[PDB]
């Protein structure tokens, strides 16, 4: 569903399977984080369900030794001098040596200013050790981290739990239609996007001969050329688009190893899983109460948050003792306004909109013969209708989806393809729709702040700054301090600084906070891009200094003051809010938990073979399960009749089912529940298990 999910599906470590241990077999000792995991396996990226601690992901710098042992590199230090020699050590090898801090006060010669430096010893103990005693030091920060969890800015400020959660939702982002690069990110994004494989990389340098939406032909330096066939609207394994747009020009020379066309969640060759949105951390009339979020309808209008969803439907035309199944239009008893968008070959015309219940592929099948009702025999003489000896086993578009039609991939034995035995024709139709943002869709940042969309309210009804720019998103303040995810407001401040730009006035000497701050950072342009490594990043003082210099956009207006808050006017009442509220830009991504795929309702569907209970799941008609714990609450209220109906006539009793249906079509009073059939089936199993079981009237 995004390049990140593909990346983390590989380079991940599981504990289940043949020869491994199951969830019930897994004790509390396995799920922990052993101190030996440092640098080998990341202690963040982990599923949060029942598989917590079993399935993990490899670190960014880790390597597999030839024997199967996980091996990591580390710098070696001698007499307070760190060489550039990079050695690779296994887990047990680190016991004999002493590894040092990833971020240590190096003096450009290897010596550390103070002797005692925080180092990790053999048995996982972290103690101070004189500089002359340590022999190894870490390659770099973010060595004990994974690729997915290396994209979270201000990681060191977030709690382990929220960082874990955010790393988890990183894999669940969906590809938008624009995929804007984040304003604030980490340097890992570019490498991850390049190595994901779905961003085409010019293998050999040279100038570009010609560029087009469907193909690109690069003119190499030596005679021959190379053409890169592009993939457009390719269906993914999770029903997400895989658009691939080129980002080169007609005659600009390219270099081997350069990005050529962006992937589903990439722009300019770096990761882009979401968008940059204005943020208000204030509570708003309880529509954002308890982790809810309210978005602006501008995102609906501007298509800021919208994702294409490609759906594939299959139909099999096999061989049967009825003869064969023909893909034609001769479907019995059909109208015209439903058949208008279906071609004369038995399929939909390319580019015809359909919704639930519409006919998709006409697979006529010989009906056979059963008890033809006498009423049918009478009926055929009133309108002249023919027998229609074939059952209309066509394709009905299931409930809760619609959209346009992409294309037809038709296979047939007449086409001389390797179809399965007995199968004569295989037709796969593709349906796509543009899913707008709506209430119930799950949104989340990169710090683990989740939540559904409480309300999509118009642009007038939002706080707006003195510039008149409406806010984009609103988050609840209660969720920040109670969840230890303070990093999100830091990211918000940095995002606002990047959006506005700054010019540190280093005229009368460099400011003290900016002294350690590197060059080319004291000056910045509006809507610039900055990066922040997870553990070696911008400090608090640097952020304060950036907030101090916040040059305005077009007029003279410093909307965000030094402390970080800003003044907002209510869009409903119009009076200014009595206190300033912090504003900024935070990265927000759509999650693959849309409300459309999670809405389900059932009046009367199918039932299982053994017991007459309904089925389960959205694939069939489903029907909610009423577990025995809910029955306990049923009993606690004492609502005996409701429980009786639920367990007898809404679930089990066949005669009760048909009778109650007849009752609420005839407007008649609902009759008494009968004897459940599942109880009789249990009775029969007991009777057939050589247990004499008999129910006694008196």
């Amino acid at each position: 569903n995004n390049p990140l999910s593909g990346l983390t599906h590989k380079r991940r470590l599981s504990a289940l399977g043949p020869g491994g241990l199951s969830r019930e077999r897994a004790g509390l000792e396995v799920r922990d984080v052993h101190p030996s995991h440092y640098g080998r396996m990341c202690p963040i990226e982990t599923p949060e369900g029942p598989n917590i601690g079993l399935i993990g992901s490899l670190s960014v710098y880790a390597r597999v030794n030839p024997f199967g042992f996980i091996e990591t590199p580390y710098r070696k230090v001698v007499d307070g001098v760190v060489s550039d020699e990079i050695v690779y050590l296994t887990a047990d090898e680190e016991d004999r040596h002493v590894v040092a801090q990833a971020n240590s006060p190096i003096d450009a010669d290897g010596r550390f200013v103070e002797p005692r430096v925080l180092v990790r010893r053999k048995a996982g103990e972290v103690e101070y050790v004189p500089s002359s005693e340590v022999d190894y030091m870490d390659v770099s920060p973010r060595q004990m981290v994974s690729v997915a969890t290396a994209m979270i800015p201000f990681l060191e400020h977030d709690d382990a739990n929220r960082a874990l959660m955010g790393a988890n939702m990183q894999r669940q982002a969906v590809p938008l239609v624009r995929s804007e690069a984040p304003l604030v990110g980490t340097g890992m994004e570019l490498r991850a996007a390049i190595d994901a494989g779905d961003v085409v990389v010019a293998e050999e340098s040279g100038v570009i001969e010609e560029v087009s939406a469907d193909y690109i032909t690069v003119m190499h330096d030596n005679g021959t050329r190379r053409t890169y066939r592009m993939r457009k609207f390719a269906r993914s394994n999770h029903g997400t688009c895989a658009n691939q747009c080129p980002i080169v020009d007609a005659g600009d020379r390219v270099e081997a190893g350069q990005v050529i066309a962006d992937g589903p969640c990439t722009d300019d060759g770096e990761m882009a899983l979401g968008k940059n949105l204005l943020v208000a951390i204030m509570p708003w009339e309880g529509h954002n109460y308890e982790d809810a979020i309210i978005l602006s309808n501008r995102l609906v209008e501007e298509d800021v948050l919208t994702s294409i969803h490609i759906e594939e439907h299959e139909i099999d035309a096999r061989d049967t003792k009825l003869g064969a199944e023909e893909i034609t239009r001769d479907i019995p008893n059909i109208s015209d306004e439903v058949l208008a968008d279906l071609d004369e070959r038995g399929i939909v015309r390319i580019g015809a909109e359909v919704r639930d219940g519409d006919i998709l592929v006409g697979k006529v099948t010989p009906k056979g013969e059963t008890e033809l009702t006498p009423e049918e025999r009478l009926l055929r003489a009133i309108f002249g209708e023919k027998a229609r000896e074939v059952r209309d086993t066509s394709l009905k578009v299931p409930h809760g989806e619609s959209g346009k039609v992409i294309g037809i991939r038709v296979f047939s034995r007449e086409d001389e393809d390797e179809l399965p035995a007995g199968v004569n024709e295989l037709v796969r139709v593709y349906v796509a729709q543009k899913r707008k943002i709506s209430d119930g869709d799950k949104l989340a940042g990169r710090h683990g702040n989740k939540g559904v969309i409480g309300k999509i309210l118009p642009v007038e009804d939002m706080p707006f700054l003195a510039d008149g720019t409406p806010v984009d998103i609103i988050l609840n303040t209660h969720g920040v301090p109670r969840r230890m995810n303070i990093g999100q407001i830091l990211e918000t401040h940095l995002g606002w600084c990047a959006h506005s730009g700054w010019k540190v006035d280093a005229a009368k000497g460099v400011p003290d906070w900016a002294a350690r701050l590197p060059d080319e950072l004291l000056e910045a342009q509006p809507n610039a891009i900055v990066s922040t490594p997870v553990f070696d990043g911008a400090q608090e003082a640097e952020l304060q200094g950036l907030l101090s210099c916040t040059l305005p956009n077009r007029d003279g207006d410093v909307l965000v003051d030094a402390d970080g808050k800003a003044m907002l006017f209510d869009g409903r009442s119009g009076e200014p809010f009595p206190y300033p509220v912090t504003v900024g830009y935070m990265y927000i991504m759509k999650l693959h938990h849309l409300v459309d795929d999670k809405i389900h309702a059932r009046s009367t569907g199918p039932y299982s073979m053994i017991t007459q209970q309904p089925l389960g799941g959205k694939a069939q008609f489903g029907g909610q399960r009423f577990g025995e714990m809910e029955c306990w609450a049923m009993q606690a209220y004492g609502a005996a009749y409701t429980l009786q109906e639920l367990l007898t006539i809404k679930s089990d009793d066949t005669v009760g089912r048909v009778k109650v249906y007849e009752a609420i079509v005839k407007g008649e009073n609902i009759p008494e529940p009968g004897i459940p059939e599942s109880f009789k089936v249990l009775l029969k199993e007991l009777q057939s298990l050589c247990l004499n079981v008999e129910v006694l009237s008196s």
Partner: peptide
Amino acid sequence: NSVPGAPNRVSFAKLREPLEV
């Protein structure tokens, strides 16, 4: 950067990585 098509991402890094990932 060190990547031909890399957009300029100014970073607050304080130290240089001895090796790339």
